[PDB]
Subunit: 436 residues, 2 copies
């Protein structure tokens, strides 16, 4: 409790918030490239995401350390694989933040065309970017509530259709466009896993924010599973709903499919509603990531595995100097990217960020078995089945990324292990030292 | 000493053998795609390889554990990063052996066209493949000698030209093709590093076979550095020598540039010589890898980190059952072929991972023993780092992707096979 921690509801909405985020609005546009067979892809993507949820759920229950993934990998494998998880996820976070502010603010252009011009867009972003760094400095009680309101604002259309969308949905349109890809059923299913497997990055959120959730052992597991269950429901119900409402042809070339789901549904400026709700979604998610950025660095900084400045806190215990760095960085790697100008662009270096997150997922399912075997009782086979699913889920994600971004993920992994060696020799503690 | 270990010379020739191997004959054909500016690429590729040599040299001096890379990673980072190194490098080895038998036997087609036909080629390979598995079962004293002879047989042409090739050398020729790539100087340099940086895979050999080298602490470092020095000398002297001997135009479309080179000096039957020496090279290297395969699995098996069967030895101490597995596997993933290289490629990135964790291990374990040469050892190992990273920077993406995916599967198997036995730096209470 004591005192400014965050409760169950905010925490869980932070999970749903970060998960659904920017993408929930573009899904039916990308599945439309393959068809209604994307339903099968979901059934596979869901049980795979429920696996990784349960893993994080049980893990955080057993050890509710602050920093989630990072924490477990330190217990399991030592300071090095700890240091690796942080650096990766910490980047995966604040690069992820950058994507939110862009996408979010970009929805607002529907209201202010003023900001399609790329320069003004970047000025607006610094502003809104620092707005949320500041909200994060007034503390996790505060941003979790701003996100909680943001994300329920963002759920309005997504339930609206998910629930009321059926009233107009039919078979004729949905089924006609069952398999537009022109690939075999298993071919298609894989081509939808390319999209949908990245839909549940975010499941870690609660377990990472353990240090700031009120009753970690009860709540982190509830927020973890619950969050993922909200996301699943929406995804499935909403994008199957849209594929029986708008014809495939129109839908796959749509910039905002929910905006179009509107212009017939409630018509007129109902796109207004959706582009506000869409913008609210991201901006909420924005702040939620920058939070999590704040926490990993904190945890790692606290065990000597990240610079001391990230461990420095104000009296409430929130890492102010830590967040101001994330804030500065995002301001640097944002001016750098004024629509070309300096060089090129660049959604590569956000894509590599998304593989950085799958590495922690992997070391966590390892950590569950390697640390947790003691506490499994007679449910041993259950926990083996589940985590191997979580494994298949992480590998099968990378199996169908682009090469280019895995290559680069891998290169940054090498450079991470070059810095550890260079920065920690002397302080390092060897399982089997040499004598002097 | 006691008793059937291997001495300095065989060890070091195993190093040079495995390094130069199949590639030393194809180098000047691939550098001919860019020109005599590949000389600059070499100067960068050399000091980078002398780094990673020195690293392995000092590491194996300090700890001369059997398994080299694997050993060090276990000390440094624990059983998991140990397990990771072995599985990788063990695959790196026996996939690498498959490549050698193919290439090696393929040179012999110059004598027996009978075996360009792809079926007969694979039958031949199983035969020769199991010839060397057997030679390896009669022990490391034996294969190291077969390799030593194989690799000095393979050095004939390579010194022949490297030394005597200068008599047909022509500055005009060499210069006129200075930069055929049509890229900027730094562009060209990078386009030659693509080839040359993979030239020194093998530096690990001696430190990996520490369990079988006579006086490990003196010899593994000598064989390590010495080996790499022999490879550098040849590479540089021989391929610059050829580029002033044969015009760029001819040279870059050559199937065997040494065959063409040699036909200028000895002439006529020089192709026979070269295709025998070229085949001797690979087949020697073939056995030397299957050796190293034998040793990692042994070392890991011995620490519970690989199946017990790989730790099982005959009275001489050599892992017979272990090698028969490698032998079977190579027989399976060979008949699997017919008709009906990526894999050989992914295997090559697998070897750069151990290199990395070794330079780490040098600093993380060795800092105690650096005395007042601290800066020297930091400078050197950071080169060794740049060398490993810069290799991967210019691989194909497809084979890094797959190297990475196999890394994930490796860590899923550790979790699945070692939970209960695993020892956590910071456990939970029950
Ligand atoms: N445009 C992007 N790829 N943004 C990355 C955000 C990832 C986050 N899991 C989401 O789906 O909302
Ligand atoms: N074990 C391996 N992956 N070997 C690949 C061959 C590399 C070696 N430098 C050669 O060209 O001969």
């Amino acid at each position: 409790a004591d005192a400014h921690k965050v409760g169950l509801i905010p925490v869980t909405l932070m999970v749903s918030g970060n998960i659904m985020g920017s993408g929930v609005f573009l899904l039916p546009a990308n599945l439309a490239s393959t068809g209604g067979i994307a339903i099968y892809g979901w059934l596979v993507t869901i049980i795979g995401a429920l696996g990784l949820s349960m893993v994080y759920a049980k893990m955080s229950f057993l050890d509710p350390s602050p920093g989630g993934s990072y924490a477990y990998a330190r217990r399991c494998f030592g300071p090095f694989l700890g240091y690796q998880t942080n650096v990766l996820y910490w980047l995966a976070c604040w690069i992820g933040a950058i994507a939110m502010v862009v996408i979010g603010v970009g929805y607002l252009s529907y209201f202010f065309p003023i900001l399609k011009d790329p320069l003004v867009l970047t000025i607006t972003c610094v502003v809104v970017l620092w707005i949320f760094v500041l909200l994060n400095i007034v503390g996790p009680k505060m941003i979790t509530r701003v996100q909680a309101v943001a994300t329920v604002l963002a759920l309005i259309p997504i339930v609206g259709i998910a629930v009321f969308g059926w009233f107009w949905f039919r078979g004729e349109t949905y089924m006609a466009a069952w398999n537009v890809s022109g690939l075999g059923t298993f071919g298609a299913i894989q081509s939808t896993l390319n999209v949908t497997l990245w839909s549940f990055i975010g499941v870690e959120s609660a377990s990472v924010a353990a240090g700031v959730v009120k009753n970690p052992k009860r709540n982190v597991p509830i927020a973890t599973i619950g969050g993922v269950l909200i996301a699943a429901v929406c995804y499935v119900l909403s994008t199957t709903a849209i594929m029986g409402m708008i014809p495939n042809a129109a839908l796959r070339v749509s910039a905002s499919p929910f905006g179009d789901a509107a212009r017939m549904a409630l018509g007129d400026t109902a796109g207004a509603i959706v582009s506000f709700c869409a913008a609210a979604g991201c901006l909420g998610s924005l702040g939620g990531w920058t939070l999590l950025a704040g926490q990993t660095a904190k945890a790692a900084a606290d065990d000597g595995l990240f610079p001391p400045i990230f461990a420095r806190v104000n009296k409430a215990g929130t890492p102010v100097a830590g967040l101001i760095i994330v804030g500065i960085l995002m301001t640097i790697f944002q001016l750098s990217s004024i629509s070309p100008n300096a060089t090129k662009e660049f959604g590569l270096v956000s894509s590599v960020s998304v593989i950085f997150t799958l590495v922690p997922y992997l070391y966590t399912c390892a950590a569950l078995l390697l640390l947790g075997h003691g506490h499994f009782g007679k449910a041993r086979p259950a926990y083996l089945a589940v985590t191997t699913i979580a494994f298949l889920y992480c590998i099968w994600a990378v199996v169908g990324s682009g090469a280019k971004e895995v290559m680069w993920s891998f290169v940054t992994l090498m450079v991470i292990t070059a810095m550890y060696a260079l920065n920690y020799n002397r302080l390092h503690k060897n399982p089997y030292p040499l004598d002097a």
